RNA sequence: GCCUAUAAGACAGAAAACUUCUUAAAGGGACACAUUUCAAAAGAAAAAGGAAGCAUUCAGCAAUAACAGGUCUGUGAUGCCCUUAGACAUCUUGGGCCGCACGCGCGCUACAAUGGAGUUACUAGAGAGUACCGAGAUUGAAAUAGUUAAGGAAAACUCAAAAGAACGUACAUGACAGGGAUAAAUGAUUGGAAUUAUUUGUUUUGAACGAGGAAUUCCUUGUAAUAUCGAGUCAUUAACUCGAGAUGAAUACGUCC
């Protein structure tokens, strides 16, 4: 199957398994290699050669990292607010968590949130010369 | 049809700046003197290749 | 623009094995262009055909692989 | 004993280097050879101008430190007695007892 | 001695304008075990002729900025290129490099235009420089390795082939100079 | 016993101090053999003087070489100087000079630098430029 | 010619290669929990691709203590380091991972291959003796496969 | 003392002899003298020898006269003018010099396969260090960093190399695993104080950029270029500057366009 499907995200099957899991917006490269070792799936294999009987483990292993021996400092979302202290960010949830967070500062009218509204450099950089997108 | 010639003496450099040398050559086929404009490094000992030997490069 | 495929098929394997040894110079850079397959696969066939002895190596190292008939 | 001499003038220490060695023939029998420790240049670079104007120019100041070490057995009480000899300005003499 | 303990120096040059200007076998020092000689060929006029012919090709493969000062890597490409070249023509790669230089060397240049002849030393300098452009450009963003990319350039320019990058340039200016008489 | 001759080779900064004495052609460079030099591309580079005059001359010489500076290519050239200098010194103090003369003439008939060090050194950096001759870019307007 | 006097008479990489199975066959090098969840230090962005990267690394460290008597973790961190080029600024050297390099040294103490001297870690009689025979196995393999340059 | 060899020696602890290398003093050593040619001459070129032959190379010092060039915001160098107890004098708290619709100058990183990524052995030079300065060694940690802590006022001790190379049936021409911008969580160091993120660690986020118009800069040999190291600033902070070594091009021996 040349075009795989997992956690609503389509990955190219012409690459190796670790380098096709990078298609998921919540999983990069270091995370991708770890789940390959955790799931007991060879890294040298291609993603488009893997049986579907194990693909359901990868979607499970990403949405349930605590039970599968993953260090807590490897998580893209640590110390989550509104209860819960686990990432659960390996999904299209990366954008969902990002937007509502910026609005939290905007609701409270923080300086970082205020800079987000104006589309300015948030992290305190020199805006005099660099970042000259036309407007 | 290319006929070579032997550089005999160097007359000087011309062509605005110095990038062309005027040398009087002789063709070893018949010992015929010829004057040509040479581009590049040249000295007395070496020879030159002339695909055309009907022109005289005296430059007026 | 190439899209030379990564997995093998009966079509090329029934034509690549009769003309690769007949070539004089065989290397992944020059062989992947003619049978329209990825040069990564050219590593597999060169070693696979080494077992059959159909192709004899003449320059093999960690940088380039050069084989001959 | 161990005589360590260091100064900014090469000939100041060198002249005194052989002054102790020659002096060792009396009230003693031998003085070890002069060890010439490598010199230590003190390079300081500054801008010539007192302001920002002008071209970018620098001057390369430097000062060299010459180190010589001597060894000698003798006696602590009568190594050189006075051990001053009215040493020239800019030179330093340090004696490592025992 | 041999260039890589594989290639001898029993090479001949057809024309007389380049026999003395190509360092092949006249002096023992031209036959060198490695194309890495640390001499000073750029301290006096007409001193670069003493450099080995294979040596002068190695240096041209060290250009375009990010490859500056990498001669060991450039030697590796040349060393692996001659083995490919030897197979492609069943002859000595040293012989193959020499005859390709004669064919790829332009014989006329135009100066601001005015068509003038080209000195034999400039013919050699442009000969290596023209084929080096093709290897550099063709191997850019291509699967073919630099050694093989350089390998096909020399053999094409060896006989007459128009597929050579250098051969196209040689006929290009000789045709432009034909319109600059 | 074990008559010895001490030589050294030089380069940009590499100093290749050798010690030639009676032996069996067992060359060790800082404890490693000459056949296992670090830059394997330059292996034939250091073995030319062995083939220049025949290894039989070096077949009974045991050289102990040490390198104390330079780079991986400066030391490669410094070794060659120490190898050629060692043979000349051995055939000078003990063996007749006429036999050494042919070896010396053969060495200088192929590579002069095999017995004389290259005097070139890194030039000092100058103010207003990134190197020894280069200068910072000039802007007028 | 060629002779064996110590392990400096063979190439470094293959001896460390042939020394990995010796640690593999012995089985006294246990596998901690962070073997796959860490990189070799600072500049790296990926964990080592070789599944047995510890065994080749442990053998490589065992060679370092053989050449140097008094060595430390800090002196080994710089040996196993790379260049830090994660931004636009020019790269500069950074030290390796102390934990992944001191862990191997501690384990090598239990095997008896190294001891704990006042100035770091140094080999023992069994440690010095063990690597010599393997250095001969590659030596005999090397001379049987390759032609000496002198000859 | 230890260990491997088939026969060489290796390593660890002192012991004591020399100076090829090392260091640093004194002299020696090229003056174009010696040959050929060219110009009664000052002189020029080849080649030889030589560590060294362009004034041997790179730098320092650097003539007379002048600018109404910059500096009175370096000076307890200074005239005149101005403010001179609600002060333009002095101190404290907070902010700004970082502010962005845009234009310009100096640079760093990239656009890749002469490469990025995973491993392995590497080879330098020249700097700096007190009572708390440079910090060794032992530990936990995934890293940033934490706890106890030798020796060192230093040829003594600390202070250490990557570009490149070797290793693999990895990558395979794909804005891909090139590029690391902008952001989001979180961990520490310095600081009395880090918000407008000081600096930096882990994971995720994966933007322009496919070699660059007119113009225009620097450069002739260990030079350019490429990548890096030390120091000045420094409680903490280089993409800067001043130096240092590591590989080592091409093109000229020319003319006033």
PDB file of N, CA and C in Angstrom, chain G residues 5-85:
ATOM      1  N   UNK G   5      53.706  -6.382  18.897  1.00  0.00           N
ATOM      2  CA  UNK G   5      54.314  -6.062  20.181  1.00  0.00           C
ATOM      3  C   UNK G   5      53.236  -5.572  21.138  1.00  0.00           C
ATOM      4  N   UNK G   6      52.188  -4.972  20.582  1.00  0.00           N
ATOM      5  CA  UNK G   6      51.058  -4.472  21.351  1.00  0.00           C
ATOM      6  C   UNK G   6      49.905  -4.234  20.383  1.00  0.00           C
ATOM      7  N   UNK G   7      48.780  -3.749  20.917  1.00  0.00           N
ATOM      8  CA  UNK G   7      47.599  -3.538  20.085  1.00  0.00           C
ATOM      9  C   UNK G   7      47.757  -2.371  19.123  1.00  0.00           C
ATOM     10  N   UNK G   8      48.823  -1.587  19.253  1.00  0.00           N
ATOM     11  CA  UNK G   8      49.088  -0.497  18.318  1.00  0.00           C
ATOM     12  C   UNK G   8      49.596  -0.984  16.969  1.00  0.00           C
ATOM     13  N   UNK G   9      49.603  -2.293  16.724  1.00  0.00           N
ATOM     14  CA  UNK G   9      50.063  -2.857  15.464  1.00  0.00           C
ATOM     15  C   UNK G   9      48.914  -3.242  14.540  1.00  0.00           C
ATOM     16  N   UNK G  10      47.693  -2.803  14.843  1.00  0.00           N
ATOM     17  CA  UNK G  10      46.525  -3.047  14.005  1.00  0.00           C
ATOM     18  C   UNK G  10      45.728  -1.753  13.904  1.00  0.00           C
ATOM     19  N   UNK G  11      44.796  -1.726  12.948  1.00  0.00           N
ATOM     20  CA  UNK G  11      43.925  -0.569  12.796  1.00  0.00           C
ATOM     21  C   UNK G  11      43.014  -0.459  14.013  1.00  0.00           C
ATOM     22  N   UNK G  12      42.646   0.777  14.356  1.00  0.00           N
ATOM     23  CA  UNK G  12      41.878   1.000  15.576  1.00  0.00           C
ATOM     24  C   UNK G  12      40.433   0.541  15.424  1.00  0.00           C
ATOM     25  N   UNK G  13      39.833   0.768  14.255  1.00  0.00           N
ATOM     26  CA  UNK G  13      38.395   0.562  14.112  1.00  0.00           C
ATOM     27  C   UNK G  13      38.044  -0.922  14.160  1.00  0.00           C
ATOM     28  N   UNK G  14      38.815  -1.767  13.469  1.00  0.00           N
ATOM     29  CA  UNK G  14      38.462  -3.182  13.406  1.00  0.00           C
ATOM     30  C   UNK G  14      38.726  -3.891  14.729  1.00  0.00           C
ATOM     31  N   UNK G  15      39.759  -3.474  15.468  1.00  0.00           N
ATOM     32  CA  UNK G  15      39.992  -4.055  16.786  1.00  0.00           C
ATOM     33  C   UNK G  15      38.829  -3.763  17.721  1.00  0.00           C
ATOM     34  N   UNK G  16      38.323  -2.528  17.694  1.00  0.00           N
ATOM     35  CA  UNK G  16      37.134  -2.197  18.468  1.00  0.00           C
ATOM     36  C   UNK G  16      35.928  -2.968  17.946  1.00  0.00           C
ATOM     37  N   UNK G  17      35.861  -3.178  16.629  1.00  0.00           N
ATOM     38  CA  UNK G  17      34.810  -4.017  16.060  1.00  0.00           C
ATOM     39  C   UNK G  17      34.899  -5.440  16.595  1.00  0.00           C
ATOM     40  N   UNK G  18      36.086  -6.045  16.510  1.00  0.00           N
ATOM     41  CA  UNK G  18      36.279  -7.411  16.977  1.00  0.00           C
ATOM     42  C   UNK G  18      36.233  -7.525  18.491  1.00  0.00           C
ATOM     43  N   UNK G  19      36.234  -6.406  19.209  1.00  0.00           N
ATOM     44  CA  UNK G  19      36.140  -6.425  20.659  1.00  0.00           C
ATOM     45  C   UNK G  19      34.705  -6.316  21.156  1.00  0.00           C
ATOM     46  N   UNK G  20      33.750  -6.036  20.265  1.00  0.00           N
ATOM     47  CA  UNK G  20      32.361  -5.892  20.690  1.00  0.00           C
ATOM     48  C   UNK G  20      31.735  -7.242  21.010  1.00  0.00           C
ATOM     49  N   UNK G  21      32.007  -8.260  20.187  1.00  0.00           N
ATOM     50  CA  UNK G  21      31.467  -9.586  20.460  1.00  0.00           C
ATOM     51  C   UNK G  21      32.056 -10.182  21.732  1.00  0.00           C
ATOM     52  N   UNK G  22      33.297  -9.827  22.071  1.00  0.00           N
ATOM     53  CA  UNK G  22      33.877 -10.299  23.324  1.00  0.00           C
ATOM     54  C   UNK G  22      33.073  -9.795  24.516  1.00  0.00           C
ATOM     55  N   UNK G  23      32.613  -8.547  24.454  1.00  0.00           N
ATOM     56  CA  UNK G  23      31.688  -8.053  25.465  1.00  0.00           C
ATOM     57  C   UNK G  23      30.294  -8.637  25.276  1.00  0.00           C
ATOM     58  N   UNK G  24      29.939  -8.998  24.040  1.00  0.00           N
ATOM     59  CA  UNK G  24      28.639  -9.611  23.787  1.00  0.00           C
ATOM     60  C   UNK G  24      28.594 -11.044  24.307  1.00  0.00           C
ATOM     61  N   UNK G  25      29.644 -11.824  24.037  1.00  0.00           N
ATOM     62  CA  UNK G  25      29.666 -13.214  24.483  1.00  0.00           C
ATOM     63  C   UNK G  25      29.752 -13.310  26.001  1.00  0.00           C
ATOM     64  N   UNK G  26      30.496 -12.400  26.634  1.00  0.00           N
ATOM     65  CA  UNK G  26      30.658 -12.456  28.083  1.00  0.00           C
ATOM     66  C   UNK G  26      29.333 -12.229  28.798  1.00  0.00           C
ATOM     67  N   UNK G  27      28.541 -11.271  28.324  1.00  0.00           N
ATOM     68  CA  UNK G  27      27.256 -11.002  28.932  1.00  0.00           C
ATOM     69  C   UNK G  27      27.313 -10.299  30.267  1.00  0.00           C
ATOM     70  N   UNK G  28      28.489  -9.841  30.693  1.00  0.00           N
ATOM     71  CA  UNK G  28      28.618  -9.128  31.953  1.00  0.00           C
ATOM     72  C   UNK G  28      28.351  -7.635  31.821  1.00  0.00           C
ATOM     73  N   UNK G  29      28.171  -7.131  30.602  1.00  0.00           N
ATOM     74  CA  UNK G  29      27.786  -5.739  30.383  1.00  0.00           C
ATOM     75  C   UNK G  29      26.266  -5.685  30.300  1.00  0.00           C
ATOM     76  N   UNK G  30      25.627  -5.356  31.418  1.00  0.00           N
ATOM     77  CA  UNK G  30      24.177  -5.257  31.450  1.00  0.00           C
ATOM     78  C   UNK G  30      23.705  -4.033  30.667  1.00  0.00           C
ATOM     79  N   UNK G  31      22.425  -4.047  30.316  1.00  0.00           N
ATOM     80  CA  UNK G  31      21.809  -3.019  29.485  1.00  0.00           C
ATOM     81  C   UNK G  31      20.910  -2.167  30.379  1.00  0.00           C
ATOM     82  N   UNK G  32      21.258  -0.900  30.635  1.00  0.00           N
ATOM     83  CA  UNK G  32      20.381  -0.040  31.443  1.00  0.00           C
ATOM     84  C   UNK G  32      19.105   0.356  30.715  1.00  0.00           C
ATOM     85  N   UNK G  33      18.271   1.168  31.366  1.00  0.00           N
ATOM     86  CA  UNK G  33      16.965   1.525  30.824  1.00  0.00           C
ATOM     87  C   UNK G  33      17.011   2.679  29.831  1.00  0.00           C
ATOM     88  N   UNK G  34      18.108   3.434  29.773  1.00  0.00           N
ATOM     89  CA  UNK G  34      18.208   4.594  28.899  1.00  0.00           C
ATOM     90  C   UNK G  34      19.055   4.323  27.662  1.00  0.00           C
ATOM     91  N   UNK G  35      19.197   3.058  27.268  1.00  0.00           N
ATOM     92  CA  UNK G  35      20.071   2.726  26.148  1.00  0.00           C
ATOM     93  C   UNK G  35      19.512   3.273  24.840  1.00  0.00           C
ATOM     94  N   UNK G  36      18.189   3.245  24.673  1.00  0.00           N
ATOM     95  CA  UNK G  36      17.571   3.683  23.430  1.00  0.00           C
ATOM     96  C   UNK G  36      16.928   5.059  23.524  1.00  0.00           C
ATOM     97  N   UNK G  37      16.816   5.628  24.722  1.00  0.00           N
ATOM     98  CA  UNK G  37      16.134   6.900  24.918  1.00  0.00           C
ATOM     99  C   UNK G  37      17.092   8.080  25.008  1.00  0.00           C
ATOM    100  N   UNK G  38      18.381   7.874  24.735  1.00  0.00           N
ATOM    101  CA  UNK G  38      19.371   8.934  24.839  1.00  0.00           C
ATOM    102  C   UNK G  38      20.228   8.956  23.582  1.00  0.00           C
ATOM    103  N   UNK G  39      20.856  10.103  23.352  1.00  0.00           N
ATOM    104  CA  UNK G  39      21.890  10.252  22.344  1.00  0.00           C
ATOM    105  C   UNK G  39      23.254  10.238  23.027  1.00  0.00           C
ATOM    106  N   UNK G  40      24.312  10.286  22.223  1.00  0.00           N
ATOM    107  CA  UNK G  40      25.660  10.207  22.769  1.00  0.00           C
ATOM    108  C   UNK G  40      26.148  11.526  23.353  1.00  0.00           C
ATOM    109  N   UNK G  41      25.323  12.570  23.361  1.00  0.00           N
ATOM    110  CA  UNK G  41      25.743  13.815  23.969  1.00  0.00           C
ATOM    111  C   UNK G  41      24.945  15.042  23.580  1.00  0.00           C
ATOM    112  N   UNK G  42      25.658  16.109  23.224  1.00  0.00           N
ATOM    113  CA  UNK G  42      25.067  17.425  23.009  1.00  0.00           C
ATOM    114  C   UNK G  42      24.692  17.658  21.548  1.00  0.00           C
ATOM    115  N   UNK G  43      25.684  17.610  20.658  1.00  0.00           N
ATOM    116  CA  UNK G  43      25.486  18.029  19.277  1.00  0.00           C
ATOM    117  C   UNK G  43      24.615  17.066  18.486  1.00  0.00           C
ATOM    118  N   UNK G  44      24.528  15.809  18.908  1.00  0.00           N
ATOM    119  CA  UNK G  44      23.717  14.840  18.189  1.00  0.00           C
ATOM    120  C   UNK G  44      22.236  15.172  18.320  1.00  0.00           C
ATOM    121  N   UNK G  45      21.479  14.834  17.276  1.00  0.00           N
ATOM    122  CA  UNK G  45      20.031  14.956  17.292  1.00  0.00           C
ATOM    123  C   UNK G  45      19.318  13.618  17.188  1.00  0.00           C
ATOM    124  N   UNK G  46      20.045  12.525  16.973  1.00  0.00           N
ATOM    125  CA  UNK G  46      19.463  11.199  16.859  1.00  0.00           C
ATOM    126  C   UNK G  46      20.239  10.227  17.733  1.00  0.00           C
ATOM    127  N   UNK G  47      19.527   9.246  18.277  1.00  0.00           N
ATOM    128  CA  UNK G  47      20.190   8.152  18.960  1.00  0.00           C
ATOM    129  C   UNK G  47      20.983   7.327  17.947  1.00  0.00           C
ATOM    130  N   UNK G  48      22.071   6.688  18.378  1.00  0.00           N
ATOM    131  CA  UNK G  48      22.892   5.924  17.431  1.00  0.00           C
ATOM    132  C   UNK G  48      22.080   4.859  16.708  1.00  0.00           C
ATOM    133  N   UNK G  49      22.319   4.747  15.399  1.00  0.00           N
ATOM    134  CA  UNK G  49      21.533   3.838  14.574  1.00  0.00           C
ATOM    135  C   UNK G  49      21.859   2.380  14.864  1.00  0.00           C
ATOM    136  N   UNK G  50      23.102   2.082  15.211  1.00  0.00           N
ATOM    137  CA  UNK G  50      23.496   0.706  15.487  1.00  0.00           C
ATOM    138  C   UNK G  50      22.863   0.241  16.791  1.00  0.00           C
ATOM    139  N   UNK G  51      22.120  -0.870  16.795  1.00  0.00           N
ATOM    140  CA  UNK G  51      21.511  -1.338  18.051  1.00  0.00           C
ATOM    141  C   UNK G  51      22.525  -1.663  19.132  1.00  0.00           C
ATOM    142  N   UNK G  52      23.725  -2.102  18.757  1.00  0.00           N
ATOM    143  CA  UNK G  52      24.780  -2.443  19.709  1.00  0.00           C
ATOM    144  C   UNK G  52      25.832  -1.347  19.798  1.00  0.00           C
ATOM    145  N   UNK G  53      25.406  -0.084  19.728  1.00  0.00           N
ATOM    146  CA  UNK G  53      26.346   1.031  19.776  1.00  0.00           C
ATOM    147  C   UNK G  53      27.094   1.100  21.100  1.00  0.00           C
ATOM    148  N   UNK G  54      26.517   0.563  22.175  1.00  0.00           N
ATOM    149  CA  UNK G  54      27.212   0.552  23.458  1.00  0.00           C
ATOM    150  C   UNK G  54      28.431  -0.357  23.394  1.00  0.00           C
ATOM    151  N   UNK G  55      28.281  -1.531  22.776  1.00  0.00           N
ATOM    152  CA  UNK G  55      29.366  -2.506  22.749  1.00  0.00           C
ATOM    153  C   UNK G  55      30.565  -1.981  21.970  1.00  0.00           C
ATOM    154  N   UNK G  56      30.321  -1.337  20.826  1.00  0.00           N
ATOM    155  CA  UNK G  56      31.419  -0.733  20.079  1.00  0.00           C
ATOM    156  C   UNK G  56      31.982   0.466  20.835  1.00  0.00           C
ATOM    157  N   UNK G  57      31.118   1.239  21.498  1.00  0.00           N
ATOM    158  CA  UNK G  57      31.598   2.375  22.279  1.00  0.00           C
ATOM    159  C   UNK G  57      32.386   1.914  23.498  1.00  0.00           C
ATOM    160  N   UNK G  58      31.897   0.886  24.195  1.00  0.00           N
ATOM    161  CA  UNK G  58      32.600   0.388  25.374  1.00  0.00           C
ATOM    162  C   UNK G  58      33.975  -0.149  25.008  1.00  0.00           C
ATOM    163  N   UNK G  59      34.067  -0.884  23.899  1.00  0.00           N
ATOM    164  CA  UNK G  59      35.364  -1.354  23.427  1.00  0.00           C
ATOM    165  C   UNK G  59      36.265  -0.187  23.046  1.00  0.00           C
ATOM    166  N   UNK G  60      35.690   0.850  22.433  1.00  0.00           N
ATOM    167  CA  UNK G  60      36.473   2.025  22.067  1.00  0.00           C
ATOM    168  C   UNK G  60      37.032   2.725  23.300  1.00  0.00           C
ATOM    169  N   UNK G  61      36.224   2.850  24.355  1.00  0.00           N
ATOM    170  CA  UNK G  61      36.717   3.429  25.601  1.00  0.00           C
ATOM    171  C   UNK G  61      37.786   2.535  26.216  1.00  0.00           C
ATOM    172  N   UNK G  62      37.620   1.215  26.098  1.00  0.00           N
ATOM    173  CA  UNK G  62      38.620   0.291  26.624  1.00  0.00           C
ATOM    174  C   UNK G  62      39.964   0.463  25.927  1.00  0.00           C
ATOM    175  N   UNK G  63      39.956   0.902  24.668  1.00  0.00           N
ATOM    176  CA  UNK G  63      41.211   1.183  23.980  1.00  0.00           C
ATOM    177  C   UNK G  63      41.857   2.463  24.492  1.00  0.00           C
ATOM    178  N   UNK G  64      41.050   3.451  24.882  1.00  0.00           N
ATOM    179  CA  UNK G  64      41.595   4.720  25.357  1.00  0.00           C
ATOM    180  C   UNK G  64      42.372   4.540  26.657  1.00  0.00           C
ATOM    181  N   UNK G  65      41.814   3.781  27.604  1.00  0.00           N
ATOM    182  CA  UNK G  65      42.508   3.544  28.863  1.00  0.00           C
ATOM    183  C   UNK G  65      43.748   2.686  28.663  1.00  0.00           C
ATOM    184  N   UNK G  66      43.846   1.986  27.534  1.00  0.00           N
ATOM    185  CA  UNK G  66      45.026   1.176  27.267  1.00  0.00           C
ATOM    186  C   UNK G  66      46.199   2.042  26.822  1.00  0.00           C
ATOM    187  N   UNK G  67      45.925   3.126  26.095  1.00  0.00           N
ATOM    188  CA  UNK G  67      46.962   4.048  25.649  1.00  0.00           C
ATOM    189  C   UNK G  67      47.308   5.102  26.691  1.00  0.00           C
ATOM    190  N   UNK G  68      46.352   5.493  27.530  1.00  0.00           N
ATOM    191  CA  UNK G  68      46.562   6.503  28.558  1.00  0.00           C
ATOM    192  C   UNK G  68      46.360   5.871  29.927  1.00  0.00           C
ATOM    193  N   UNK G  69      47.322   6.082  30.828  1.00  0.00           N
ATOM    194  CA  UNK G  69      47.243   5.463  32.147  1.00  0.00           C
ATOM    195  C   UNK G  69      46.196   6.149  33.014  1.00  0.00           C
ATOM    196  N   UNK G  70      46.385   7.437  33.285  1.00  0.00           N
ATOM    197  CA  UNK G  70      45.433   8.185  34.081  1.00  0.00           C
ATOM    198  C   UNK G  70      44.480   8.993  33.229  1.00  0.00           C
ATOM    199  N   UNK G  71      43.256   8.501  33.064  1.00  0.00           N
ATOM    200  CA  UNK G  71      42.255   9.166  32.244  1.00  0.00           C
ATOM    201  C   UNK G  71      40.986   9.332  33.066  1.00  0.00           C
ATOM    202  N   UNK G  72      40.191  10.345  32.712  1.00  0.00           N
ATOM    203  CA  UNK G  72      38.982  10.651  33.439  1.00  0.00           C
ATOM    204  C   UNK G  72      37.786  10.744  32.509  1.00  0.00           C
ATOM    205  N   UNK G  73      36.614  10.911  33.123  1.00  0.00           N
ATOM    206  CA  UNK G  73      35.388  11.067  32.350  1.00  0.00           C
ATOM    207  C   UNK G  73      35.417  12.369  31.558  1.00  0.00           C
ATOM    208  N   UNK G  74      35.889  13.453  32.179  1.00  0.00           N
ATOM    209  CA  UNK G  74      35.943  14.739  31.491  1.00  0.00           C
ATOM    210  C   UNK G  74      36.884  14.687  30.294  1.00  0.00           C
ATOM    211  N   UNK G  75      38.050  14.056  30.457  1.00  0.00           N
ATOM    212  CA  UNK G  75      38.974  13.903  29.341  1.00  0.00           C
ATOM    213  C   UNK G  75      38.424  12.986  28.257  1.00  0.00           C
ATOM    214  N   UNK G  76      37.466  12.123  28.595  1.00  0.00           N
ATOM    215  CA  UNK G  76      36.811  11.282  27.603  1.00  0.00           C
ATOM    216  C   UNK G  76      35.592  11.953  26.988  1.00  0.00           C
ATOM    217  N   UNK G  77      34.963  12.884  27.712  1.00  0.00           N
ATOM    218  CA  UNK G  77      33.832  13.618  27.156  1.00  0.00           C
ATOM    219  C   UNK G  77      34.253  14.443  25.948  1.00  0.00           C
ATOM    220  N   UNK G  78      35.410  15.106  26.033  1.00  0.00           N
ATOM    221  CA  UNK G  78      35.911  15.871  24.898  1.00  0.00           C
ATOM    222  C   UNK G  78      36.330  14.964  23.751  1.00  0.00           C
ATOM    223  N   UNK G  79      36.847  13.772  24.059  1.00  0.00           N
ATOM    224  CA  UNK G  79      37.184  12.823  23.004  1.00  0.00           C
ATOM    225  C   UNK G  79      35.944  12.403  22.230  1.00  0.00           C
ATOM    226  N   UNK G  80      34.850  12.133  22.933  1.00  0.00           N
ATOM    227  CA  UNK G  80      33.584  11.772  22.297  1.00  0.00           C
ATOM    228  C   UNK G  80      32.653  12.983  22.232  1.00  0.00           C
ATOM    229  N   UNK G  81      33.097  13.992  21.475  1.00  0.00           N
ATOM    230  CA  UNK G  81      32.340  15.211  21.304  1.00  0.00           C
ATOM    231  C   UNK G  81      32.279  15.603  19.838  1.00  0.00           C
ATOM    232  N   UNK G  82      31.399  16.557  19.548  1.00  0.00           N
ATOM    233  CA  UNK G  82      31.169  17.011  18.184  1.00  0.00           C
ATOM    234  C   UNK G  82      31.075  18.533  18.190  1.00  0.00           C
ATOM    235  N   UNK G  83      30.631  19.086  17.065  1.00  0.00           N
ATOM    236  CA  UNK G  83      30.485  20.522  16.886  1.00  0.00           C
ATOM    237  C   UNK G  83      29.022  20.926  17.012  1.00  0.00           C
ATOM    238  N   UNK G  84      28.780  22.009  17.744  1.00  0.00           N
ATOM    239  CA  UNK G  84      27.429  22.483  18.033  1.00  0.00           C
ATOM    240  C   UNK G  84      27.054  23.534  16.992  1.00  0.00           C
ATOM    241  N   UNK G  85      26.264  23.132  15.998  1.00  0.00           N
ATOM    242  CA  UNK G  85      25.865  23.999  14.890  1.00  0.00           C
ATOM    243  C   UNK G  85      24.350  24.000  14.728  1.00  0.00           C
TER     244      UNK G  85
END
